[PDB]
């Protein structure tokens with residue numbers, strides 16, 4: 024069992040992580056009002072409408088009625104309305120869903136941000152090693168694991184005491200981070216592990232964990248997607 | 255009579271203008287909640303807390319208890335709380351207020367944006383001409399100050415009360431201020447809206463100080479009202 028993206032990000036934020044949970048909408052009218060109100064804070068910003076379905080590959084999926092993509096960029100609130108109007112109440116078809124598709128009754132409206140880097144990061148219970156493990160890589164490709172095992176970084180975690188600052192500071196630099204982003208990444212991975220541990224999750228997968236710019240061009244770590252499984 | 259900044263900006267937005275109306279808060283704890291929720295949309299963004307008082311010179315004013323400035327930048331929601339806690343329910347002192355100061359019971363919480371240029375633009379009822387006029391300049395200097403030290407810097411545009419501003423009048427004023435590319439048409443559309451506010455609301459003055467060119471979170475350049483004053 025999994026929980027939706029926006030709920031997963033809210034749980035991450037609750038434990039100190041930085042994640043763009045946006046705001047959930049159950050109608051295109053509401054999605055429009057969300058984008059419209061956001062223009063009070065950052066006028067002229069663009070928007071991203073993300074179908075909230077329990078399935079992966081939304082960006083490269085397509086809707087039964089023709090529209091392409093479960094993650095679509097929008098320039099205005101009215102564009103947000105049109106896009107949301109094609110998602111809410113319709114069936115999306117991705118790789119993970121096959122031809123049966125998956126129904127959608129809600130989307131996530133968020134602001135478009137400038138993305139500098141995209142990382143992968145997951146936390147799971149590794150039976151072979153008998154402990155939790157943090158997997159991460161800087162590649163954009165399981166594909167990257169077979170064509171480049173050097174690209175994957177696996178960090179075994181003390182089943183009792185959890186991660187250490189040394190483990191995380193190294194994982195941050197192993198991914199190419201320096202300056203203030205090192206501690207920022209450390210703090211975020213700490214929060215993600217607390218989610219995994221304290222919520223008895225079977226997997227916490229951030230695909231992508233990104234380096235983004237703030238409206239004033241400050242570089243920060245932020246979860247741009249999130250999947251958390253249970254039971 | 256004038257109306258507060260955020261009310262003026264909401265009116266501009268209603269008529270098609272772009273203005274950072276932010277969101278008003280009537281308590282410090284609400285100001286924090288607004289900033290915190292904004293981190294759901296643009297995580298890591300900074301914030302600006304702007305005292306909502308019927309007086310000018312907030313940026314260089316000071317509060318009866320020590321804090322400096324009616325428009326202060328904040329890095330986190332908790333900083334927004336601390337700042338708002340000193341503004342809401344306290345007295346601000348600026349040039350226009352003297353030593354008696356003015357009371358503040360609400361603030362505007364906005365996201366911090368990158369400002370590239372700041373213009374002045376006003377629309378006032380000219381009695382010698384018997385029609386409205388648009389005054390604007392790109393200089394950073396008081397407005398009457400720049401007028402006396404450089405009257406060539408100021409651009410005056412009489413407006414036909416029957417046809418409103420013309421596309422020709424506005425395209426020139428935009429380029430006279432140094433705008434090119436998409437900002438020209440953008441500025442035209444915004445000044446049109448500003449006149450509709452002035453005309454349809456029977457205003458005595460619509461003053462945008464500053465009318466700015468800002469970056470969006472994705473670095474697109476757009477015209478935006480960063481302040482607003484509307485009299486009656």
Ligand SMILES: Nc1ncnc2c1ncn2[C@@H]1O[C@H](COP(=O)(O)OP(=O)(O)O)[C@@H](O)[C@H]1O
Pocket residue numbers: 043071073078079080081082083094133134135136137138141230231247248249
């Ligand atoms: N707020 C955003 N602004 C801009 N691009 C975004 C934003 N959020 C996500 N993206 C981009 O959209 C892509 C697809 O979104 P994602 O949440 O990964 O869905 P999925 O993995 O199902 O395709 C991401 O890999 C990222 O590059």
Ligand SMILES: Nc1ncnc2c1ncn2[C@@H]1O[C@H](COP(=O)(O)OP(=O)(O)O)[C@@H](O)[C@H]1O
Pocket residue numbers: 274302304309310311312313314325364365366367368369372463464480481482
């Ligand atoms: N969202 C913002 N982000 C960054 N700077 C801002 C923002 N809004 C306003 N400012 C800056 O703060 C200054 C003071 O604010 P303003 O609204 O002009 O108040 P006042 O002119 O009454 O002192 C503006 O001239 C502008 O340079």
Ligand SMILES: [Cl-]
Pocket residue numbers: 039040041
């Ligand atoms: Cl945070």
Ligand SMILES: [Mg+2]
Pocket residue numbers: 230231248249
């Ligand atoms: Mg993803």
Ligand SMILES: [Mg+2]
Pocket residue numbers: 463464481482
């Ligand atoms: Mg001003």
Ligand SMILES: [Mg+2]
Pocket residue numbers: 238239240368469473
């Ligand atoms: Mg920028």
